Enzyme design. Structure first.
Site, PDB file in Angstrom:
ATOM      1  N   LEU A  95     -17.597 -42.923  -6.037  1.00 12.22           N
ATOM      2  CA  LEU A  95     -16.228 -43.336  -5.745  1.00 12.22           C
ATOM      3  C   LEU A  95     -15.906 -42.955  -4.304  1.00 12.22           C
ATOM      4  CD1 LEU A  95     -14.112 -40.569  -6.014  1.00 12.22           C
ATOM      5  CD2 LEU A  95     -14.979 -40.848  -8.352  1.00 12.22           C
ATOM      6  N   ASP A  96     -15.430 -43.928  -3.535  1.00 11.44           N
ATOM      7  CA  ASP A  96     -15.218 -43.750  -2.109  1.00 11.44           C
ATOM      8  C   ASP A  96     -14.104 -42.736  -1.842  1.00 11.44           C
ATOM      9  OD1 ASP A  96     -13.471 -45.422  -3.346  1.00 11.44           O
ATOM     10  OD2 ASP A  96     -13.378 -46.915  -1.740  1.00 11.44           O
ATOM     11  N   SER A  97     -13.898 -42.446  -0.553  1.00 12.80           N
ATOM     12  CA  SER A  97     -12.815 -41.556  -0.149  1.00 12.80           C
ATOM     13  C   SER A  97     -11.455 -42.087  -0.577  1.00 12.80           C
ATOM     14  CB  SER A  97     -12.841 -41.346   1.365  1.00 12.80           C
ATOM     15  OG  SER A  97     -12.369 -40.055   1.710  1.00 12.80           O
TER      16      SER A  97
END
Ligand SMILES: CCCCCCCCCCC[C@H](O)CC(=O)SCCNC(=O)CCNC(=O)[C@H](O)C(C)(C)COP(=O)(O)O
Lengths: 128, 121, 172, 127, 122, 86, 459, 71, 81
Positions: free
Chosen positions: F40-42
């Site tokens: 999961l990205d930033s």
């Protein structure tokens, strides 16, 4: 729609909502360039001599005394008697002057012709 | 977790909104019946009851916001009036805000306008 | 440097409901308005034409300013808060120990001894860090604000005294 | 979200250099050594009666300290404001002008002894 | 209030003007005007150092109060019978002022009625 | 008022940011790199970035939102900012 | 008055021959002692001026200024310790000679009994001040500073010379007592207003009014730290004494002729206060506030009111004390920082706890708050100006509206906030400074407790 | 500051709300009701209004004494 | 009592009113990104306070006791006099 924000000289339109600040041309993205470089190098000087134990004393940039000079002494040599300059200089050089003089002399003569016959009262004002 | 401060705040809120027999009764309550009685500016007259309504409003605003019942704060619970000296000072002013409202109102020599009768509304 | 689309939308999301929690106060109301579907941000991830991305940015950034409080939430330590610069009164620069006197120098003796060899480490580190920063500095005035590290052993990072000897946030 | 080997090295090295610095900020047992000073023998006796610290001794020192606060701050001020007042202030005229107490119809006076007649017939408006 | 509604909202003349009230002869249907009996005396209440604002006809019940108030210490629950006499006197004076107001009020309605039926009778 | 010892904020970061149930705790770690270690990205960081700062009683710099990604980074910034030195 | 003058004159060889390092000590000690002898002169018999001889006399108007000057001489004397520790011994003795000759000429002016002698010593002050400003200055513009100061003062003074010799030829004498007792109504003749202008403009020149106030800002900035307080302190008040004495012959023509300058002061004391919100230099800040205070004292003089005279007489002393008070602080901060920029170093209370305390009561005295003699001196002027022309309180209220906005602004931008991180040579305050502002501020309240002495000669 | 705090923090639990500061708070809580209601019983008149409002448009023409309404 | 850290698995959304909004976002088709750090701030230990009037009625039953004590005080004052 949502109330549009307009810029003002006192309350500038916030950076987010200007139209052109999101319309950055690639020329502008290059135009910012390495200002961070020269700024960071000025930092490099600052932190260098600050962290330098040999140096002990006040360290000041040309930036501050440039403004000091340009606010104190650079005025006159670059000052030119433009028509606007003479106009507003005379405006507040004899407007408030003669206006205060007028209102003061007005009230002073008011009491002058209110006291010669005795209209004005001086009953308890002995400690003039 | 803030009981003593809660009771103090509630009774102070009722006092600034003219609590009978409290400091408020011999206060803004008296001044309001005086301004309604005395020949006063109309807009001032309506304005001061609007002011009393707003005085109730925000005084209960702190009530239903602070002591509402939904915790919202750092995970470490620090809301606690356990300091004995804090309790002593708070109750020292508290007794006055309960008592001293009337421990001076009738003791003083008769000094104001004693308007006794007036329209019920 | 230049704040990119990702950074712009991240700042907008951060500022959007910091704000909206102050709009709703209650955490149940928070969770509802935040879950006023979060995929409202992700419902239109397919914006391969960045012109439409910019237009929806004109909607996003220029809808927040009026859905946000005229008196929004600020934290104490946050700028514009209650304790952002409250404790700056008690903080004092580190160089304010050399002016101390033999009475006070010997009346906290070993503290000034430890400061003595700490500044000795500063002495042995200054020339090493300046010679390390000059050799690897690219021409034209570095290239970023990134400060070079200590690549050797036993050495010190460049320009390390100020950010370490800075006064503590709780100087009292 | 771009944390290069440079500034993680820089950052955690600054972290534990400052950690070591603070470990050296720990004052040694002898610190914060203060010099000898002058302590009053009477207060020495009072303190030596509080090392055991029985409640009665605590209360006794409390009332003794309140007593010295009172003598220095309550009747010491009235020692000299009264001297200034009834011998120097009242020595010059019109310095302490007092509002006449409300003389009342039906009150006698201590010196002359005469009484002003009581108020005349009331309306007798009974409740 | 009804008085403001009649005057301010309605016909200003129809209701008494506070800055003017009363503007009428005192025996407006009141022959042989026996003025209110003097029970309050100015010398006594000046001796009592009363406020000039409260130096009204009820003063008699005020001065007496201070007597008991001067002889009640230490006590604030004393001096009730004469202070309640003063309270009833303030009641009678407030009903006196408002009843004089309503007296000249219905007399002002009488003024309009009278000048409309005896002058506009033509 | 606590000194907020390294163990104090250490417990904070094993309750907050270990609050994250979108990722199962078995793969969760103090070194967890959410962009690929968790996938999961930033993006799905910033929201809880705002939550945790509301708890500790501090404000994460808006400039420091990016790269502030793992529990080790959380204790890092909290320790340096809150002079967590004991 | 030989009792106080002769010790000052004969003190000079002491400094000029004593040992290379006892000169400071001996000059200081003997200055304190001749000031001790000076305060014995505060006595004033009834309404008679304290006469001493055919040439020397004093009164309640003079005495506070005399004891003022005698009290100051030690102040710049030991303020010079820092700034003249590195220069030659003979130059040190010459500097002390300049200060002593200046103080001698001041006490000669103030005790003068006849007009032209007062004038001779009135211009005799420029020579020591000019020498001090030009020689021992620091920056470059000090030369133009000396030019402006000297030329302004002279261009003012010469008409007064011609007027005074004309008075002597016409009336018959220039003695103060006789011209007060043999005073005659100065009529409205077209020669009489030029007579008045000649007798007034000279003092007005060294009392910087609106327009003619460039020499003080462009001289006090780079004047030597010891000299600057002397200029800002006394020589603006010898002109005030000049008005005090010369106005006895300028009536009744002063009734309507004063109007142009009069208002030029009130609006003036606003502009130099309005200018006073924005200064890049702290020394210029104090100079402009000083100019505002002297515009106040000018309008105090020109009304010719006993309450106006009392407010003035208090105002010269109060303003001189507070102005030199602030100038000492400016010197100290500049000497530690070797610059005179305004916002260069804010938040100095975090480094010098007692120095910003000194700043605090210095600004408070600049505020003219009660019961300080600054407030009482201002207040008498408020009352006199109100009784003069009703509305004057509006402009003067603007002045007691701007004064604190700049005074406390200087506190918040020097002492409050936090130190600027670059400067690191600011050491702990030396006892010399804080001692000197102690001797400056404590008697400011001491004589406040006894305001009769400085209240005025019309008491 | 040091260990062994009086309200030494159990993580996310009630910080030992002392029941003594509770019972004094209830002393003053009963005292506010004391001052609002035993004053009411002592003298309700203060918040009752003593005497009533004599509504003007209800009275007789004699005490008001209009000159004869017919005249 | 030095940092009595509890288990995290116990303080989850279940039972708490945050489940209802969890149902709400279930209507939105989502799961709560943080809806567990506040489970204590929904339990009865610190949540579920008395009403605002209920806060005002701080022991008002003791006020109802004051009713009777004051009424009986005046009643025995008048009865025996
Ligand atoms: C209730 C009141 C309002 C309360 C507040 C909540 C509501 C706000 C309303 C906003 C309306 C607006 O139309 C929608 C918006 O903001 S769209 C922003 C993104 N627009 C793009 O076009 C992104 C394209 N994609 C990327 O830039 C990268 O993929 C990304 C950065 C996401 C990866 O991130 P990861 O961290 O690496």
């Amino acid at each position: 729609s949502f109330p549009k924000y307009k810029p003002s000289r006192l309350a500038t339109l916030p950076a987010t909502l200007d139209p052109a600040e999101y319309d950055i041309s690639p020329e502008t993205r290059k135009a910012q360039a390495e200002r961070l470089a020269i700024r960071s190098r000025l930092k490099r000087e600052y932190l260098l001599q600050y962290n330098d134990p040999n140096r002990l004393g006040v360290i000041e940039d040309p930036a501050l005394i440039r403004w000091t000079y340009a606010r104190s002494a650079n005025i006159y040599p670059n000052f030119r008697p433009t028509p606007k300059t003479s106009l507003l200089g005379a405006l507040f050089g004899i407007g408030p002057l003669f206006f205060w003089y007028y209102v003061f002399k007005t009230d002073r003569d008011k009491k002058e012709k209110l006291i010669q016959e005795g209209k004005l009262d001086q009953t308890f004002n002995i400690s003039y | 977790a803030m009981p003593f401060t809660t009771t103090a705040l509630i009774i102070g809120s009722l006092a600034l909104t003219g609590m009978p027999y409290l400091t408020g009764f011999y206060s803004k309550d008296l001044i309001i019946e005086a301004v309604n009685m005395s020949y006063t500016n109309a807009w001032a007259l309506l304005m001061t009851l609007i002011a009393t309504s707003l005085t109730a409003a925000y005084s209960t605003r702190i009530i239903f916001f602070a002591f509402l019942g939904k915790p919202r704060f750092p995970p470490l619970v620090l809301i606690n009036e356990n300091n004995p000296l804090l309790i002593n000072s708070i109750k020292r002013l508290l007794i006055g805000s309960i008592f001293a409202g009337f421990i001076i109102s009738n003791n003083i020599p008769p000094m104001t306008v004693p308007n006794t009768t007036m329209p019920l509304y | 440097a230049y704040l990119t689309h990702q950074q712009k939308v991240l700042r907008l999301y951060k500022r959007a409901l910091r704000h909206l929690e102050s709009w709703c106060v209650h955490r149940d109301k928070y969770r509802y308005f935040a879950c006023l579907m979060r995929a409202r941000f992700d419902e239109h991830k397919n914006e391969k034409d960045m012109v439409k991305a910019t237009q929806l940015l004109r909607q996003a950034e220029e809808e927040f300013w009026y859905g946000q409080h005229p008196q929004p939430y600020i934290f104490p330590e946050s700028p514009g808060g209650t304790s952002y610069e409250r404790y700056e009164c008690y903080k004092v620069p580190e160089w304010c120990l050399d002016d101390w006197h033999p009475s006070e120098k010997a009346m906290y003796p070993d503290y000034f001894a430890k400061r003595e060899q700490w500044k000795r480490l500063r002495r042995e580190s200054w020339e090493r860090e300046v010679k390390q920063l000059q050799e690897e500095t690219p021409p034209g005035g570095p290239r970023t604000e990134a400060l070079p590290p200590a690549r050797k052993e036993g050495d010190l990072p460049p320009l390390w005294w100020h950010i370490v000897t800075r006064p503590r946030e709780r100087p009292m | 979200s771009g944390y290069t080997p440079d500034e993680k090295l820089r950052l955690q090295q600054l972290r534990e250099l400052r950690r070591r610095w603070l470990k050296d900020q720990e004052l040694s047992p002898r610190e914060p050594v203060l010099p000898p000073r002058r302590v009053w023998p009477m207060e020495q006796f009072w303190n030596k009666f509080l090392q055991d610290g029985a409640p009665w001794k605590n209360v006794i020192y409390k009332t003794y300290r309140h007593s010295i606060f009172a003598v220095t701050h309550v009747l010491i001020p009235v020692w000299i404001i009264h001297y200034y007042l009834k011998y120097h202030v009242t020595a010059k005229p019109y310095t302490v002008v007092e509002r006449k107490p409300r003389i009342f119809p039906g009150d006698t006076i201590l010196e002359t002894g005469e009484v002003i007649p009581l108020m005349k017939e009331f309306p007798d408006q009974h409740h | 209030g009804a008085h403001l509604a009649r005057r301010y909202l309605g016909d200003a003349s129809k209701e008494p003007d506070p800055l003017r009230m009363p503007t009428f002869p005192p025996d407006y249907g009141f022959p042989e005007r026996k003025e209110r009996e003097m029970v309050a005396t100015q010398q006594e209440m000046n001796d009592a150092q009363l406020m000039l604002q409260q130096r009204d006809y009820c003063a008699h019940y005020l001065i007496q109060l201070l007597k008991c108030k001067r002889d009640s210490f230490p006590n604030f629950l004393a001096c009730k019978h004469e202070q309640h006499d003063w309270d009833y006197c303030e009641h009678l004076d407030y009903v006196k002022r408002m009843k004089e107001f309503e007296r000249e009020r219905r007399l002002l309605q009488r003024k309009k009625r009278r000048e409309q039926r005896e002058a506009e009778m033509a | 008022a606590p000194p907020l010892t390294l163990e104090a904020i250490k417990d904070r970061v094993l309750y907050v940011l270990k609050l994250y149930d979108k990722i199962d705790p078995e793969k969760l770690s103090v070194n967890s790199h959410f962009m690929k270690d968790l996938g999961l990205d930033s993006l799905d960081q910033v929201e809880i970035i705002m939550a945790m700062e509301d708890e500790f009683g501090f404000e994460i710099p808006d400039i420091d939102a990016e790269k502030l990604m793992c529990p080790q980074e959380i204790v890092d910034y909290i320790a340096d900012k809150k002079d967590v030195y004991e | 008055m030989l009792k106080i003058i002769i010790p000052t004159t004969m003190l000079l060889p002491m400094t000029w021959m004593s040992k290379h390092n006892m000169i400071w000590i001996n000059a200081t000690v003997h200055s304190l002692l001749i000031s001790l002898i000076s305060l014995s002169l505060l006595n004033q018999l009834g309404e008679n001026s304290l006469n001493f001889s055919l040439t020397f006399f004093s009164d309640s108007l003079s005495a506070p200024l005399l004891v003022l000057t005698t009290w100051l001489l030690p102040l710049m004397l030991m303020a010079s310790q820092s700034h003249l520790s590195k220069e030659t011994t003979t130059r040190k003795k010459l500097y002390i000679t300049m200060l002593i000759l200046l103080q001698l000429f001041l006490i000669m002016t103030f005790t003068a009994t006849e007009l032209i002698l007062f004038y001779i010593l009135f211009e005799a002050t420029l020579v020591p001040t000019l020498i001090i400003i030009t020689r021992w200055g620091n920056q470059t513009e000090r030369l133009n500073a000396g030019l402006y100061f000297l030329f302004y003062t002279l261009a003012g003074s010469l008409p007064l010379l011609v007027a005074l010799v004309y008075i002597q030829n016409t009336t018959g004498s220039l003695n103060f007592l006789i011209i007060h007792y043999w005073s005659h109504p100065l009529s409205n003749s077209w020669s009489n207003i030029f007579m008045w202008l000649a007798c007034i403009m000279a003092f007005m020149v060294k009392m910087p009014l609106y327009g003619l106030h460039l020499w003080l800002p462009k001289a006090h900035v780079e004047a030597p730290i010891a000299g600057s307080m002397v200029l800002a302190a006394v020589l603006l008040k010898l002109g005030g004494y000049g008005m005090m004495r010369i106005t006895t012959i300028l009536n009744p023509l002063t009734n309507y002729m004063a109007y142009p300058f009069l208002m030029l002061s009130m609006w003036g004391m606003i502009m130099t206060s309005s200018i006073c919100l924005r200064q890049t230099d702290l020394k210029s800040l104090i100079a402009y506030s000083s100019v505002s205070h002297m515009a106040l004292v000018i309008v105090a003089i020109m009304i010719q009111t006993p309450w106006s005279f009392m407010g003035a007489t208090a105002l010269m002393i109060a303003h001189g004390l507070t102005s030199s008070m602030l100038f000492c602080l400016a010197n100290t901060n500049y000497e530690r920082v070797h610059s005179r920029t305004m916002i260069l170093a804010r938040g100095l209370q975090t480094l010098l706890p007692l120095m910003a305390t000194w700043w605090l009561m210095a600004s408070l005295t600049n505020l003219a708050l009660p019961p300080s003699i600054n407030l009482i001196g201002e207040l008498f002027i408020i009352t006199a100006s109100f009784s003069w022309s009703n509305i004057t309180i509006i402009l003067m209220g603007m002045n007691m509206m701007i004064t604190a906005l700049y005074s406390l602004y200087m506190l918040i931008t020097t002492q409050r906030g936090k130190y600027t991180h670059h400067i690191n040579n600011i050491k702990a305050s030396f006892t010399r400074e804080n001692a000197l502002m102690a001797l400056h501020i404590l008697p400011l309240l001491l004589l406040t407790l006894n305001p009769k002495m400085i209240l005025g000669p019309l008491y | 500051a040091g260990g062994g705090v009086h309200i030494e923090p159990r993580y996310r639990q009630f910080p030992q709300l002392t029941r003594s500061q509770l019972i004094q708070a209830e002393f003053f809580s009963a005292t506010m009701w004391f001052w609002i209601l035993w004053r009411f019983w002592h003298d309700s008149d203060a918040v009752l209004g003593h005497f009533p409002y004599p509504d003007p448009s209800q009275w007789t023409d004699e005490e008001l004494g209009i000159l004869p309404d017919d005249e | 009592s030095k940092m009595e850290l509890p288990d995290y698995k116990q303080w989850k959304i279940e039972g708490t009113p945050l489940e209802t909004v969890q149902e709400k976002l279930a209507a939105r088709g989502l799961r709560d990104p943080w809806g567990r750090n506040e489970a204590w701030r929904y339990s009865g230990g610190f949540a579920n306070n008395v009403s605002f009037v209920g806060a005002l009625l701080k022991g008002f039953k003791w006020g109802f006791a004051a009713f009777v004590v004051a009424v009986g005080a005046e009643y025995y004052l008048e009865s025996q006099n």
